[PDB]
Amino acid sequence: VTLADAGFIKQYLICAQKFNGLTVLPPLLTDEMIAQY
């Protein structure tokens, strides 16, 4: 699935706002915290 996510992340890991106003926020739980649960 990251082979699809990485497309979305570069088109839209300190994510930042694009000039069109699009912003991608981080989840509250990291993939390491979901792995630990």
């Binding site: 839209y12 000039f19 106003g21």
Partner: protein
């Protein structure tokens, strides 16, 4: 279980860095506050899920 938490600013999107367009956008009232709130409610729900 979730989808990417995306927040769009309705002011930045409609009127990006124009104060002229921002002054006109205010004539429509709350629609940008309501749209930023609606997207923020979706973003909070991804953590809940």
């Amino acid at each position: 279980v979730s989808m990417t938490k995306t927040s769009v600013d309705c002011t930045m999107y409609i009127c990006g860095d124009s104060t002229e367009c921002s002054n006109l956008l205010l004539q429509y009232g709350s629609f940008c506050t309501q749209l930023n709130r609606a997207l923020t409610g979706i973003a909070v729900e991804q953590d809940k899920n």
